[PDB]
Amino acid sequence: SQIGLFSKICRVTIKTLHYYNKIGLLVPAYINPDNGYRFYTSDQLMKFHQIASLRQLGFTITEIVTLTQDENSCHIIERRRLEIQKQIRD
């Protein structure tokens, strides 16, 4: 799945996929070396779904990197829970 087709699958812009690759959040499965074209697979959509599910909760990008790479990390989500409670009060 080339980046255009995949960007329409997940319904997000191309620059978002470029950015998620740049920061190492969502890396394409296979980058063609001379052109540089990015090609994704189903198991990239499986990760983008998790990314978008966490990003609708307001988690900052680095928090998502930690949430996806470090397990049993409920203290960061609870911390974010307390911050969201503070912003709701505010």
């Binding site: 499965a29 296979y30 063609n32």
Partner: protein, 476 residues
């Protein structure tokens, strides 16, 4: 014949081009078959070099863990799913592992052709195929210039018979027993030769790594490189026979691009380059005529060159396409509205912001010649109305020298310390101006004292005692 009657390069091109008769529907198929026969011949020759198929096998081992995809290494199979390629690489692997353990020598010389004609099944991509052929090329080319310098290691010693020297060199290739009979010749030349028999050693034995590196010896892969050259020069003179026979297609396309900023021959040369690409990328097994594909490539090359090199100040292909779209939209609006469209309504026929269209309209103009006759006078050109605007007027040069003199007067009407602080604080009589810290380091003084000095000196120069010479330089 007609040779010598014209000097026009376009007449010469057409005359020389028309000596090649066109191809029929089955002529292109024959020529494409010859091209692919040449490339599979060089394939089946390089399959004699086993490290080639080991590289391709470890490339598939990279495809195992998603280092690449299958479309990057193989484009098809003749005798696309990953279903068949697993047993395909099993077919090549089983042949390689059965060819490995055999060392013999007529016993081990049919296994290699079995390897080559099982490897023929792979329709390789140009990437890997080019990689293998230039790899074996550079390998035998370095060991081959090594063989050539082994020969011309005798030319520094003497001038020698090579026809007597070729009968010896081939076949031993692990020892100097071919070099031992050179002193059995003992004509004067073969005196000098033997005294360099030491500095030939590190040459004459080091290809002995490749004697066991490829598994083959140098005369076998010598014939393999010779048949490589036969195959690739067979494909090369077949692509040339298909390029030369479609050179009228280029002209039929390139006449449609004539007055767009390039000469006719520039267009047909760029079309020729595109046609050579079209020949390189043609698949006759699609059952399509050559004209349908070659037109795409010729059109691409020609329009690309018009975009690149038809303008004096080059605009990119994105702006070239925007200008072309604007001109087409504008000639449709002119036909509809019966008048030239103003850029505001041209901004709603297109869907761009209006200042973008205004700057796009400002771009497209081409530079005027500085030799255009004005009013067609042909004794007055545009270039002799253009003034040099970078010069400074000699009144301003005289003013600058007068100001330098006045500043010298005023600064000599100060003490040496204040004049030095002002001549370093501005760049007067120096090549550079300095910060307060640099002027202070010149005087082993901290910056604020330098600031105080410079302030009091400016206060003195502001007085009506010293400033009536300087105030005259400020225009009221």
């Amino acid at each position: 014949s007609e040779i010598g009657r014209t000097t026009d390069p376009v007449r010469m091109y057409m005359r020389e081009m028309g000596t090649v008769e066109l191809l029929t529907r089955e002529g292109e198929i024959d020529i494409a078959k010859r091209i692919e026969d040449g490339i599979n011949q060089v394939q089946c020759s390089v399959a004699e070099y086993p490290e080639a198929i080991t590289y391709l096998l470890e490339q598939y081992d990279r495809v195992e863990a998603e280092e690449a995809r299958l479309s990057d290494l193989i484009t098809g199979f003749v005798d696309i799913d990953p279903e068949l390629a697993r047993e395909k690489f099993a077919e090549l692997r089983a042949q390689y592992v059965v060819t490995r353990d055999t060392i013999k020598h007529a016993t081990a010389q049919e296994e290699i052709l079995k390897l080559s004609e099982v490897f023929k099944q792979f329709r390789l991509v140009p990437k890997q195929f080019d990689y293998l052929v230039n790899s074996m090329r550079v390998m035998m080319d370095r060991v081959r210039t090594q063989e050539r310098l082994i020969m011309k290691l005798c030319v520094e010693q003497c001038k020698m018979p090579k026809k007597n020297f070729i009968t010896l060199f081939t076949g031993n290739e692990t020892s100097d027993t071919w070099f031992n009979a050179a002193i059995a010749m003992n004509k004067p030349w073969s005196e000098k030769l033997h005294d360099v028999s030491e500095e030939v050693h590190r040459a004459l034995q080091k290809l002995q790594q490749i004697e066991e590196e490829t598994g083959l010896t140098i005369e076998q892969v010598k014939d393999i490189n010779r048949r490589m050259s036969i195959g690739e020069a067979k494909a090369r003179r077949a692509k040339k026979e298909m390029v030369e026979a479609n050179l009228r297609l280029v002209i039929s396309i390139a006449k449609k691009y004539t007055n767009r900023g390039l000469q006719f021959l520039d267009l047909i040369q760029e079309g020729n380059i595109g046609l050579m690409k079209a020949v390189d990328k043609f698949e006759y097994r699609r059952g399509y005529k050559f004209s349908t594909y070659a037109t795409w490539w010729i059109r691409q090359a020609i329009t690309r060159s018009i975009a690149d090199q038809a303008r004096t100040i080059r605009i990119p292909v994105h702006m070239i396409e925007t200008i072309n779209k604007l001109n087409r939209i504008s000639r449709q609006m002119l036909q509809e509205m019966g008048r030239e469209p103003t850029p505001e309504e041209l901004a709603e026929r297109m869907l761009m912001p209006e200042d973008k269209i205004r700057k796009v309209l400002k771009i497209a103009k081409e530079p005027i010649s500085m030799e255009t006759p004005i009013g067609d006078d042909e004794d007055s050109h545009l270039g002799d109305f253009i003034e040099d605007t970078t010069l400074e007027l000699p009144l301003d040069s005289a003013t600058t020298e007068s100001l330098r003199a006045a500043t010298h007067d005023v600064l000599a009407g100060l003490t040496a310390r204040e004049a030095k602080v002002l001549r370093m604080r501005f760049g007067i009589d120096m090549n550079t101006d300095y910060t307060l810290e640099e002027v202070g380091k010149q005087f082993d003084v901290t910056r604020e004292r330098i600031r105080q000095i410079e302030a009091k000196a400016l206060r003195k120069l502001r007085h009506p005692s010293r400033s009536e010479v300087l105030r005259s330089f400020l225009d009221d």
